[PDB]
Amino acid sequence: MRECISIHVGQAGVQIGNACWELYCLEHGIQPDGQMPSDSFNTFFSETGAGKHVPRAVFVDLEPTVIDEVRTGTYRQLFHPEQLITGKEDAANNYARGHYTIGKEIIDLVLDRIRKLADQCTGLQGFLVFHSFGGGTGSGFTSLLMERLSVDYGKKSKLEFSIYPAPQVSTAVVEPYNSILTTHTTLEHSDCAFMVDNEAIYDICRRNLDIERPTYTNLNRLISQIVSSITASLRFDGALNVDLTEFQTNLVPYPRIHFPLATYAPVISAEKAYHEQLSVAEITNACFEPANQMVKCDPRHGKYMACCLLYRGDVVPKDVNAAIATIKTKRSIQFVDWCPTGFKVGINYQPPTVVPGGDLAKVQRAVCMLSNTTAIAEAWARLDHKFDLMYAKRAFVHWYVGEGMEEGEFSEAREDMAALEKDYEEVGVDS
Amino acid sequence: MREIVHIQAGQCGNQIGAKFWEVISDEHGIDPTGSYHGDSDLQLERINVYYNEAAGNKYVPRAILVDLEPGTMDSVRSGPFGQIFRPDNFVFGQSGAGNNWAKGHYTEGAELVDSVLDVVRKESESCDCLQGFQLTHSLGGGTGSGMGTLLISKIREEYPDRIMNTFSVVPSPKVSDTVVEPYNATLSVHQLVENTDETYCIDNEALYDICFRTLKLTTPTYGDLNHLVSATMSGVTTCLRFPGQLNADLRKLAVNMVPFPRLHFFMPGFAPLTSRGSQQYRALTVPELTQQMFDAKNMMAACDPRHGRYLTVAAVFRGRMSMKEVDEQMLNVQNKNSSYFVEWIPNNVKTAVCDIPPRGLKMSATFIGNSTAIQELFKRISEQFTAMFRRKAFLHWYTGEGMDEMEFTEAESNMNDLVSEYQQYQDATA
């Protein structure tokens, strides 16, 4: 049928991939060794041997530490050994190293593995890429891989799950350089790119889940739940199925504006679960508060351009229609005038599954929301500002130049970002 | 995999290296005989970064012993953890520098550098993917300063792409252990500013203050000081040996902490440091570690960071903790102390987290700050140097080894230019 390939790059990508694959194996009832203890999951798992299922995943990193963590964990015997590809030295938060000097060493091997996996599928429709803007390996090698994939294939979709840099929380000094460079390179090669923000997920875990020690496991579990809600329409049948292509056809009005925002509902703790009889309308309302967004930006500062809703479990289409109508009539949110019909809605039968040891209670209905809004423009501006603050005095620039990246490239990237900002302010003006 | 070759020169280098290797061996669970008696697989998973495995379940540290007099490393060999080292790595001369930079750099170093380089090459080619070189020494001695600069220059010529890190014992501001330390310090920085990727500065006076004030130690010895230095070294190089949620290696630190090629002089710090009686009254929490680290008194260099502004900061947390707390502490520090950070760099702080708890307590954290205030140190040295160069005191001791006053003038001019750069990088201009 329809097949999808998952690509995980860098530390963030690999950890998110581990969480996602644990969640998928739990959802489809697959033991950690690959067996089944008792079938539409051919989209992600391929059959082999005597009832063994191998995920269609490729893990790429320039440092062996995290991949070796995976290779000795509980899921060591799940992944195909050749799908975990490692280098020897990481980019060290250097875009140039991961894009020019180091990435070119293993780009060919990664592409070989990619094409070997792709030839196995009959109805492949797209690739999933997990990575991070801030890192060197993540941003640089992701840009290189997107370039190669777009050249080789061109027509298949390429969705992106990326960790946008947080407005306040930072874990590196060279984040603006890497972010601007990778955005300039990948701006014309990604069909759609959802983002998550670590600061926003920290805030969500603090406010809703009543957790004061949210290790990366909780954040990765949240992200895995979101991606599961995205791909459930492929993995299960429902009253209204949504493919991978429909996302890009419905949320990207122009090729240069493909940066939606991902939320999820309901996010509650076990104790508060008993005191709230959760219904479709209230979940739909909850998906639209700024405090529940997973990117630290206020949607009320901008205007929506397109919205996508994905419902799971006990869901009645009439209630969905009523809730969406109520949302539309509420004037606290705004929509661009040139998009009178700004909603796509899909419904799936299979409810979300609760991972034991997790921190989310059991619900019979869930909603994943993706909104392409102009409020993200502010974020870009902030990033650009930081870049300028660091580029007037040419700080750290020699590090990038010594790896072969010409200085003028920086200028191009910055100029490109300026245009992108203009683009947003051009479409955020009604007429 | 990513492997580190460790070099020690001079008395201070040998002593600090002995303490550091004892600390590392205890951390990885290796007995003094060199046979692994550990209890975890992670101790052996990344043992190759520092150790070479020999036949019969034995591990040989990847270390080189360099000195111009045999007394120090004879003491090292005859003492405990003396049979762990490979005997062929012990390189000694017979004369000694005698606290003379010229003697150790031009006359004795010229004789010893060939053998030392041969041993270093033999160690390096036996590696798989060398990550960089690490050296421990001082600047106020003859052998340490001269041979360290010579070896650093030769290795930088040999491997221009690897990583050079140095732990240098800079001279103390108040009490001097030698009369001719300004000459050696200037002549050593004149080479460090050109051939070293990054350098951490440690002052014995600050360590004395730490042990007497924080640790409540009545009679500190060099053992305690080398213990602290070894703890800092292990905290720095812990992401190469144990897995963590967010890890950083040497190249990552160099990229994130060196804005310009001539500014690579950092100030280290360690937390938590507490006495035996006070450990019952305080709670080990991430905010406590962060508050201790960003403390003027806790610095391992005798410079007050409040005089200048930070350029970059690296925080290597270790143990099990929550990075929400880590990031909230970083944000609180940045907003409260916003007067101590340069405006032309947002996100001054880089963070790394190692899962394995420090051998020791539940949680710990290493701090590495790149502050402009360190220029004061250089400035101070300049004054002393010129105060002793106008009268040409002790100058014949050096010019009798072939050196000339042109070298002294060049060194003082270069390091004064460095002082100007560090000082005037405190201008916002925006």
């Binding site: 122009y254 240069r256 504006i257 300028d388 580029y391 007037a392 005095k393 040419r394 910055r414 100029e415 300026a418 245009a419 992108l420 900002e421 203009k422 683009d423 051009e426 479409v427 007429s431 | 230019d417 100007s420 750069e421 005037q424 990088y425 201009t429």
Partner: peptide, 27 residues
């Protein structure tokens, strides 16, 4: 005796790349 390389960086004018205004004059 050393001055830093301070560059007068500025984005004077940048034009939008989206073709949203092409058919704004359509009947």
């Amino acid at each position: 005796k050393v001055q830093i390389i301070n560059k007068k960086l500025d984005l004077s004018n940048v034009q939008s790349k989206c073709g949203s205004k092409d058919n704004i004059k359509h009947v």
